[PDB]
Coordinates of C-alpha atoms and ligand atoms in Angstrom, one line a residue:
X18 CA 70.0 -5.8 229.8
X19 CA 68.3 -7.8 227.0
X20 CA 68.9 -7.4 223.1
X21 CA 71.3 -4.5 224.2
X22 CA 73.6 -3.7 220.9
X23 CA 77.3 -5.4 221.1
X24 CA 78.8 -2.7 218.5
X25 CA 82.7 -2.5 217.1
X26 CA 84.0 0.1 215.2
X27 CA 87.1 -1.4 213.7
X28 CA 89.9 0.6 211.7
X29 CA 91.9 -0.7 208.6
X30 CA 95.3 1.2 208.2
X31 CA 95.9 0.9 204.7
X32 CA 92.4 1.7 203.1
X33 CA 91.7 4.3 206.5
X34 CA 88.3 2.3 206.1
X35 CA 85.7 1.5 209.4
X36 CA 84.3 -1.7 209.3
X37 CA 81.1 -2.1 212.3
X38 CA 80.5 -5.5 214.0
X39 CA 77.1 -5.3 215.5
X40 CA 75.5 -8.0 217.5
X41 CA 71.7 -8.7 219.6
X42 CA 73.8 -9.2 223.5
X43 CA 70.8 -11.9 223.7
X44 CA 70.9 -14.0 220.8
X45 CA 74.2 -13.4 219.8
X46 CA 73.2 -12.6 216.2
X47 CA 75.7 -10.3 214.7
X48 CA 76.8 -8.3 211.2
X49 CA 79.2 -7.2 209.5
X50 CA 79.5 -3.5 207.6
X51 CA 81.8 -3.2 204.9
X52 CA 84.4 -6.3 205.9
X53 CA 88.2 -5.7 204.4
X54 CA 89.5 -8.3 202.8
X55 CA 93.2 -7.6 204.5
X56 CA 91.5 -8.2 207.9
X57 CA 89.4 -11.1 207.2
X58 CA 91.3 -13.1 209.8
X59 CA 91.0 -10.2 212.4
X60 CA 87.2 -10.3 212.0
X61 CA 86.2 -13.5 212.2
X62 CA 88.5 -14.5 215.1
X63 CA 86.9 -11.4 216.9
X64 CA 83.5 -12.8 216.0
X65 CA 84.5 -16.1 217.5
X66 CA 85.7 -14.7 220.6
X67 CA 82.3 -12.5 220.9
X68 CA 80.9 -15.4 221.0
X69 CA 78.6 -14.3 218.1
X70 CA 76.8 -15.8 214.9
X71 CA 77.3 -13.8 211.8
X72 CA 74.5 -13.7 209.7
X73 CA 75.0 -11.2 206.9
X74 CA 78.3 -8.9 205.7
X75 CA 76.5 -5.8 204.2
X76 CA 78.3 -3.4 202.0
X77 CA 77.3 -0.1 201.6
X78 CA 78.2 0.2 198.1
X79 CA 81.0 -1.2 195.6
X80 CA 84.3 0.3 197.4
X81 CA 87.2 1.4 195.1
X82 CA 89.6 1.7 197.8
X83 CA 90.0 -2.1 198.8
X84 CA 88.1 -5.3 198.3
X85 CA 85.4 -6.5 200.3
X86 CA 86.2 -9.6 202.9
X87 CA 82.2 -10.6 202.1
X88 CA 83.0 -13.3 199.6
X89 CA 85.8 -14.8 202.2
X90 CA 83.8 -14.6 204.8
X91 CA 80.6 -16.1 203.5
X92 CA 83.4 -19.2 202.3
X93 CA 85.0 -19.2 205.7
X94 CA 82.0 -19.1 208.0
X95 CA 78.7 -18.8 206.0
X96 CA 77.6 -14.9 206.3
X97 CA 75.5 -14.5 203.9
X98 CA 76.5 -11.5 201.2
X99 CA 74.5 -8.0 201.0
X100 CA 74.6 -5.4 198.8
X101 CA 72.0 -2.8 197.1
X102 CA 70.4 -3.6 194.5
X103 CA 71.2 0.0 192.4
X104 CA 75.2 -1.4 193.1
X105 CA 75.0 -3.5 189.7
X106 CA 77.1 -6.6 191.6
X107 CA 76.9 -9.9 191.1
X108 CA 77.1 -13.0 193.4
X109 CA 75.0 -11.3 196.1
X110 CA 72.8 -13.5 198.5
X111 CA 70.5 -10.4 199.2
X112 CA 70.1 -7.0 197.3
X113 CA 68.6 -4.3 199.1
X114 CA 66.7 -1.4 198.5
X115 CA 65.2 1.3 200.3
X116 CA 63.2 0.7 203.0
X117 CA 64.4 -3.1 204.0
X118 CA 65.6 -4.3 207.0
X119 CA 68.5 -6.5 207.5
X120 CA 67.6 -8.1 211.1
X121 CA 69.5 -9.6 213.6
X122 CA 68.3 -11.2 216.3
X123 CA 65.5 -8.3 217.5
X124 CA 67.8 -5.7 216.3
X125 CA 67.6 -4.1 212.8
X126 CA 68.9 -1.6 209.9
X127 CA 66.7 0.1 207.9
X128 CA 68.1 1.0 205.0
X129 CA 68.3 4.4 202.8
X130 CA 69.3 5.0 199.6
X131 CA 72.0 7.7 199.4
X132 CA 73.6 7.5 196.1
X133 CA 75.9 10.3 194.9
X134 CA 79.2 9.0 195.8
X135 CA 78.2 6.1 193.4
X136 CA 74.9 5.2 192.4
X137 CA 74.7 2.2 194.5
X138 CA 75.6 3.8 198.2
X139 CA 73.0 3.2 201.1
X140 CA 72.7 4.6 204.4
X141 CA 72.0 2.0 207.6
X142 CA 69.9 3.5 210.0
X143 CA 69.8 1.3 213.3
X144 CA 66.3 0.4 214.5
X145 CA 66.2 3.1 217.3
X146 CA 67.5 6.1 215.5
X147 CA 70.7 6.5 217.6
X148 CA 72.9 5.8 214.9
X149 CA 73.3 5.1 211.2
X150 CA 76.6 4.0 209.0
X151 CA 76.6 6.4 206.1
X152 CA 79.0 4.7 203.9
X153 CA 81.4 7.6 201.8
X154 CA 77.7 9.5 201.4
X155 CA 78.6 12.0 204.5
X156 CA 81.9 11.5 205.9
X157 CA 83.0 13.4 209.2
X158 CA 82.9 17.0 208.2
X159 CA 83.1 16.5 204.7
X160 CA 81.6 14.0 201.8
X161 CA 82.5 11.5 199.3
X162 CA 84.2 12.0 196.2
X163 CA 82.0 12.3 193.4
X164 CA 84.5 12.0 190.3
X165 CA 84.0 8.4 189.8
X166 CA 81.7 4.9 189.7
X167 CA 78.8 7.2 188.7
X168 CA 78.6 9.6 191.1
X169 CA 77.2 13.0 191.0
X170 CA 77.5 16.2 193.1
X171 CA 73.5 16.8 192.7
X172 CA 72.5 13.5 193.7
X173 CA 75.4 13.5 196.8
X174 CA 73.6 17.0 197.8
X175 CA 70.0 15.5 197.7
X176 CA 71.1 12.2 199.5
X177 CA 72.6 13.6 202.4
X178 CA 69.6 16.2 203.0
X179 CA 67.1 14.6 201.9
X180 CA 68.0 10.9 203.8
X181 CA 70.9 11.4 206.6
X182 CA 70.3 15.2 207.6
X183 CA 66.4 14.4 208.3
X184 CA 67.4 11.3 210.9
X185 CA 67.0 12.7 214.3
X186 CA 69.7 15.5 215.6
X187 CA 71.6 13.2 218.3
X188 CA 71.5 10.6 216.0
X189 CA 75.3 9.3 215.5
X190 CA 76.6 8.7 212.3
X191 CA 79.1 6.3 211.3
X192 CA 81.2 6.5 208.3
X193 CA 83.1 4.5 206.5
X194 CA 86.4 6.1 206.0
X195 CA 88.3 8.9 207.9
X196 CA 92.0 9.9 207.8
X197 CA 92.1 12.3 210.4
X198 CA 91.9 10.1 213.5
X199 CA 88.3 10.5 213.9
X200 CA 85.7 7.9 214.8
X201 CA 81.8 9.3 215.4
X202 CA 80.0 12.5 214.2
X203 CA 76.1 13.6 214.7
X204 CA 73.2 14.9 212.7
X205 CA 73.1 18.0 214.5
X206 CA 76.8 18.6 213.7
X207 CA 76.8 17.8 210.0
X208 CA 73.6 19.5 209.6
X209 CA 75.2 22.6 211.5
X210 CA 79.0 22.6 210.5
X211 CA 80.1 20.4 207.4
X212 CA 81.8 23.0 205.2
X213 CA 80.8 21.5 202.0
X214 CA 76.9 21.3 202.0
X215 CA 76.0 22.2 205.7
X216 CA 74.6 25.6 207.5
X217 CA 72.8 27.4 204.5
X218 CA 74.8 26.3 201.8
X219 CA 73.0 25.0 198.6
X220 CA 72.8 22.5 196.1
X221 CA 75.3 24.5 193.3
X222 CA 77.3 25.8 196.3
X223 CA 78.4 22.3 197.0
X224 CA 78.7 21.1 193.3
X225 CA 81.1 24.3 193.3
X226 CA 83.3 23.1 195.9
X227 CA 83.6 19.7 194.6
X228 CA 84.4 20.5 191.2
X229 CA 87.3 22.4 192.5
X230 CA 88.9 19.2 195.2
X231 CA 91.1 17.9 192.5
X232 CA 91.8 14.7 194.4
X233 CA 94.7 12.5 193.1
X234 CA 94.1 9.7 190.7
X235 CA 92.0 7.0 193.0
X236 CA 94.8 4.6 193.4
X237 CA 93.4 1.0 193.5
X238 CA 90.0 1.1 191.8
X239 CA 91.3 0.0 188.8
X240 CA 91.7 -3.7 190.8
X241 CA 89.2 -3.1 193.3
X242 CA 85.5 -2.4 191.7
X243 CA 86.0 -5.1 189.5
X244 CA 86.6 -7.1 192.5
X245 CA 83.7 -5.6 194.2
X246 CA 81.4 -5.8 191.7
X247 CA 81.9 -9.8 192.0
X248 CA 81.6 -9.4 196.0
X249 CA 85.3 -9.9 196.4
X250 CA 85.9 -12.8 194.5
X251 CA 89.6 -12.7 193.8
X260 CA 96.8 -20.2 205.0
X261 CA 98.6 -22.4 207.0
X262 CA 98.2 -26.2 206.5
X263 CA 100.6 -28.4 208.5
X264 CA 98.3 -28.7 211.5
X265 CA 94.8 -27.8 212.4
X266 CA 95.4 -24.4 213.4
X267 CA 93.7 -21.1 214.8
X268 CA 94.9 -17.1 215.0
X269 CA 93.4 -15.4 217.9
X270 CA 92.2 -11.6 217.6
X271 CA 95.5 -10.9 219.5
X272 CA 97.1 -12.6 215.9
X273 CA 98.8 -15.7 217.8
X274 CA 98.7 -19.2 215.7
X275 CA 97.2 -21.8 218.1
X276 CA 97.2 -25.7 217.3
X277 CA 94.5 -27.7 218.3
X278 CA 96.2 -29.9 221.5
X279 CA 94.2 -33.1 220.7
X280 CA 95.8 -32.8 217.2
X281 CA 98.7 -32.1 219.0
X282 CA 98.8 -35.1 221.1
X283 CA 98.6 -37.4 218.2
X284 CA 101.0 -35.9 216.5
X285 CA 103.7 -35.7 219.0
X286 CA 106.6 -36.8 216.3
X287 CA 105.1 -34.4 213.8
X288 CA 106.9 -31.4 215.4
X289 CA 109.5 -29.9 217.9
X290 CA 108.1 -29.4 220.9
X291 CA 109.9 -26.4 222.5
X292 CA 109.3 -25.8 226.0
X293 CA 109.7 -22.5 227.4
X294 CA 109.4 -22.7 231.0
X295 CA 112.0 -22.0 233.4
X296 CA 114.4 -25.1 234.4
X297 CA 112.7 -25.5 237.9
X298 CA 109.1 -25.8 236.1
X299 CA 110.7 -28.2 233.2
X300 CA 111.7 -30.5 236.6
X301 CA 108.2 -29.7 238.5
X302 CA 105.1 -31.1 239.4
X303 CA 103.6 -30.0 235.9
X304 CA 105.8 -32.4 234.2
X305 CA 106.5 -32.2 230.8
X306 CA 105.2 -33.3 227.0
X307 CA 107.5 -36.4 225.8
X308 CA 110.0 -35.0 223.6
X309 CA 109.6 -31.5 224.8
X310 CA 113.1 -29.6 224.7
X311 CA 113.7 -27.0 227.3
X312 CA 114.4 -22.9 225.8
X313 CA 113.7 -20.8 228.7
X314 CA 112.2 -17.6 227.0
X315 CA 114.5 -15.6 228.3
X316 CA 117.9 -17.9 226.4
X317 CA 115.4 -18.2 223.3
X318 CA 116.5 -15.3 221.1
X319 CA 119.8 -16.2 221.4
X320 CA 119.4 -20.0 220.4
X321 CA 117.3 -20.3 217.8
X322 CA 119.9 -21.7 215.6
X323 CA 119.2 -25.3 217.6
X324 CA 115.5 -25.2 216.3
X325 CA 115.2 -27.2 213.1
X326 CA 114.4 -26.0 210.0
X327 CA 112.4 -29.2 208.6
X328 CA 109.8 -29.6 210.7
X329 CA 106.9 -26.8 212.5
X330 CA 107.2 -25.7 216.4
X331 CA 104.7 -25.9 218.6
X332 CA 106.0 -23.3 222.0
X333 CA 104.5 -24.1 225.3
X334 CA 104.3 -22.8 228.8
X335 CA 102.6 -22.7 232.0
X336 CA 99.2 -21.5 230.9
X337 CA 100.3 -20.3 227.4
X338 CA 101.3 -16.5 227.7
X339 CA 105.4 -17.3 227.6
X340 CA 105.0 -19.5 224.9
X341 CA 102.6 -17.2 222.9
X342 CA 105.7 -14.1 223.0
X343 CA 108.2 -17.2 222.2
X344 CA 105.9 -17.1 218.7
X345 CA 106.6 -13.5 218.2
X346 CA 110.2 -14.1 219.0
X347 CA 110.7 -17.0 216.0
X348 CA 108.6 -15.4 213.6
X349 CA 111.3 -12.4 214.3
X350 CA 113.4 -15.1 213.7
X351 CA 112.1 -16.4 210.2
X352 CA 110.8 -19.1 211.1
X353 CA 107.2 -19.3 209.7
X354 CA 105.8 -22.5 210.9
X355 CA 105.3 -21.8 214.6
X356 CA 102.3 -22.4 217.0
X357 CA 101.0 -22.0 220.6
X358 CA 100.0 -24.2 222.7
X359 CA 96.6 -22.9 223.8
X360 CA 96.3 -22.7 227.5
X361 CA 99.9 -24.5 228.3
X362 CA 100.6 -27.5 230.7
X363 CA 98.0 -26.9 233.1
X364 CA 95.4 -27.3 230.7
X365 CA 97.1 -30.1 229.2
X366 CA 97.2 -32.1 232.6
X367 CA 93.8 -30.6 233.6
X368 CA 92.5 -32.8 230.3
X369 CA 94.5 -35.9 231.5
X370 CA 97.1 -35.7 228.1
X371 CA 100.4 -37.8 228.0
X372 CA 103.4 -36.4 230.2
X373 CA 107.0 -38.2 230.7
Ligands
LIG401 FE1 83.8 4.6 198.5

């Protein structure tokens, strides 16, 4: 292998937006295209188990559809912010223009100005040519709006020929929203097939067609460009904690260990494992998982749980089962009793 491309296309329900992780398999240099706010958590834990430093969130223009996670995530764990330059925001650690390259590792995006949708859009076009994130400039089989933040049918037209349609015909291209269930599309099928401005259709037949979309009132860019033109600038605390990508809540067990009294410890093992070689944490009290649901009213309400297990898989589904439950300060024990015996931690 060697500088191969780790690459994520990752869906956010309630915007229908695609956010790309893209990493260097080598150095483990990674970023970020166009970040939700909503999924901050998601992202970075997905990043950490990657294994991958994040160097930059890019957006690829102000979004009116949901607030960038770039200001969270440079706070949480240093990515620096990008933006373009023709954007207008503020609080940016780079601005790009046409023609720089955001690098990571040996891997970089060129990038290509394709306003239209707004003024500020750009295009990413991965060092090799195979594919290239195109923002709302050229969606699959169809475009941007053009109605608002600027943008213009004319200059949407120009953009895509002149930019996205002249990148090489297998290219892929990436987009940044869809709401039909559709990931990927190609030069050579936009260039060929989009109904709005592809096969031989010009420059006023497109302005034409979008005249005539009538689209509903854009329903959050009221809140969200004034967010965005800031970069996004607008968590639980009794323990050290962690959410994996899967979305479990993990304490940290050397926290955990000196801070036996601080919580319940509620073991979910099976009796014959609560009695076994494994032993047992002090104070733990036995809920096998499968008596849990229907017991919960012995859990306290004045103090968090921490669920554990055999390795940690029961006790992570116990989590699910209390949070069903209402109780909302619950954690896993990461890797269960035989990791806590294979680091030599206090047992009755
Ligand atoms: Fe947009």
């Amino acid at each position: 292998g060697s500088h191969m491309l780790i690459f994520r296309q990752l869906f956010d329900q309630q915007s229908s937006t695609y956010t790309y992780l893209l990493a260097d398999s080598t150095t483990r240099e990674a970023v970020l295209i166009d970040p939700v706010f909503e999924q901050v958590r998601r992202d970075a834990a997905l990043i950490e188990e990657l294994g991958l430093h994040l160097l930059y969130t890019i957006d690829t223009h102000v979004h009116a559809d949901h607030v960038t996670g770039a200001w969270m995530l440079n706070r949480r764990i240093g990515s620096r912010i990008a933006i373009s330059a023709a954007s207008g925001a503020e609080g940016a650690d780079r601005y790009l223009s046409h023609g720089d390259k955001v690098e990571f590792g040996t891997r970089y995006l060129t990038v290509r100005a394709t306003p239209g949708h707004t003024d500020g859009c750009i295009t990413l076009v991965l060092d090799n040519e195979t594919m290239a994130f195109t923002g709302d400039c050229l969606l699959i089989r169809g475009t941007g709006r053009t109605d608002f933040q600027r943008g213009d049918a004319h200059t949407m037209f120009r953009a895509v020929h002149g930019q996205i349609f002249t990148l090489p015909t297998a290219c892929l291209l990436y987009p940044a929203h869809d709401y039909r269930g559709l990931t990927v599309t190609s030069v050579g099928e936009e260039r060929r097939f989009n109904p709005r401005l592809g096969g031989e259709l010009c420059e006023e037949d497109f302005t034409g067609y979008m005249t005539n979309l009538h689209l509903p009132h854009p329903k959050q860019i009221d809140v969200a460009v004034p967010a965005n033109l800031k970069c996004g600038l607008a968590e639980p605390d009794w323990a050290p904690l962690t959410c994996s990508f899967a979305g479990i809540w993990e304490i940290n067990a050397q926290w955990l260990e000196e801070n036996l009294r601080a919580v319940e410890i509620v073991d979910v093992r099976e009796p014959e494992e609560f009695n076994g070689p494994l032993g047992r944490i002090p104070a733990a009290r036995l809920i096998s998982l499968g008596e849990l649901a229907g017991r919960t009213a012995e859990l306290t309400k004045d103090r968090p749980i921490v669920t554990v297990c055999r390795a940690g898989g029961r006790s992570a589904q116990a989590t699910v089962m209390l949070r069903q439950a209402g109780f909302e300060r619950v954690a896993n024990l990461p890797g269960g009793m035989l990791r806590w015996r294979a680091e030599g931690r206090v047992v009755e």
